[PDB]
Design an enzyme around this catalytic site. Structure first.
Site, mmCIF file in Angstrom:
data_model
loop_
_atom_site.group_PDB
_atom_site.id
_atom_site.type_symbol
_atom_site.label_atom_id
_atom_site.label_comp_id
_atom_site.label_asym_id
_atom_site.label_seq_id
_atom_site.Cartn_x
_atom_site.Cartn_y
_atom_site.Cartn_z
ATOM 1 N N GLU A 156 0.815 -1.208 0.000
ATOM 2 C CA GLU A 156 0.000 0.000 0.000
ATOM 3 C C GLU A 156 0.849 1.259 0.000
ATOM 4 O OE1 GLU A 156 -3.035 0.293 -0.529
ATOM 5 O OE2 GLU A 156 -3.890 -1.690 -0.145
ATOM 6 N N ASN A 195 -7.867 8.983 -5.382
ATOM 7 C CA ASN A 195 -8.700 8.074 -6.146
ATOM 8 C C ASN A 195 -9.515 8.843 -7.189
ATOM 9 O OD1 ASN A 195 -7.801 5.954 -4.320
ATOM 10 N ND2 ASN A 195 -9.260 6.769 -2.830
ATOM 11 N N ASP A 203 -12.535 8.926 -7.840
ATOM 12 C CA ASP A 203 -13.800 9.478 -7.352
ATOM 13 C C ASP A 203 -13.628 10.687 -6.445
ATOM 14 O OD1 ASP A 203 -12.889 8.489 -4.912
ATOM 15 O OD2 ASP A 203 -14.634 7.279 -4.499
ATOM 16 N N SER A 231 -11.957 10.831 -3.540
ATOM 17 C CA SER A 231 -11.470 10.475 -2.222
ATOM 18 C C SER A 231 -9.947 10.322 -2.270
ATOM 19 C CB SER A 231 -12.131 9.178 -1.738
ATOM 20 O OG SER A 231 -11.734 8.100 -2.582
ATOM 21 N N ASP A 288 -6.498 8.184 -0.276
ATOM 22 C CA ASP A 288 -5.973 7.164 0.624
ATOM 23 C C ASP A 288 -4.773 7.715 1.400
ATOM 24 O OD1 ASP A 288 -7.829 5.436 -0.488
ATOM 25 O OD2 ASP A 288 -6.363 4.324 -1.660
ATOM 26 N N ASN A 303 -8.934 5.075 3.276
ATOM 27 C CA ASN A 303 -9.671 5.897 2.318
ATOM 28 C C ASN A 303 -10.600 6.872 3.025
ATOM 29 O OD1 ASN A 303 -11.063 6.892 0.079
ATOM 30 N ND2 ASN A 303 -11.482 4.871 -0.806
#
Ligand SMILES: [Cl-]
Ligand SMILES: [Cl-]
Ligand SMILES: [Cl-]
Ligand SMILES: [Cl-]
Ligand code: NA
Length: 129
Positions: free
Chosen positions: A35, A46, A48, A50, A52, A59
């Protein structure tokens, strides 16, 4: 902070994660490796809108507030910036909530595609734990 592999394994152990919800320490270290490459300051946007955050790339869509993910939740009741600290407490305690929510570690796409079903003990091999 960029953790070393065994350094992170020991910190995760100190904080309750080894065998948490049945997931051995090597699963958590592997997930962190893919990650964030063990960097607590990792962020990734991301598609959309959002974002991380942190060592386990948690998220903002569900788990933390960053003020810029319209319609999102803050289920760990934390600012997303807390997930970037050199101290992993906030990330560990939020990850415990995530991994209890029904889908286990499948919540972490990198874990499912790069750790699940592999020899995850290799990630803690040789560590003085
Ligand atoms: Cl393991
Ligand atoms: Cl928001
Ligand atoms: Cl720590
Ligand atoms: Cl599970
Ligand atoms: Na949020």
């Amino acid at each position: 902070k960029v953790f070393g592999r065994c350094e992170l394994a020991a910190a995760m152990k100190r904080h309750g994660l080894d065998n948490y919800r049945g997931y051995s320490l090597g699963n958590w270290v592997c997930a962190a490796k893919f990650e964030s490459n063990f960097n607590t300051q990792a962020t990734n946007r991301n598609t959309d809108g959002s974002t991380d955050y942190g060592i386990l790339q948690i998220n903002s869509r569900w788990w933390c507030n960053d003020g810029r993910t319209p319609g999102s939740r803050n289920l760990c009741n934390i600012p997303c910036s807390a997930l970037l600290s050199s101290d992993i407490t906030a990330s560990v305690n939020c990850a415990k909530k995530i991994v209890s929510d029904g889908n286990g570690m499948n919540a972490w796409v990198a874990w499912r595609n790069r750790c699940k079903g592999t020899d995850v003990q290799a990630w803690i091999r040789g560590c003085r734990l």
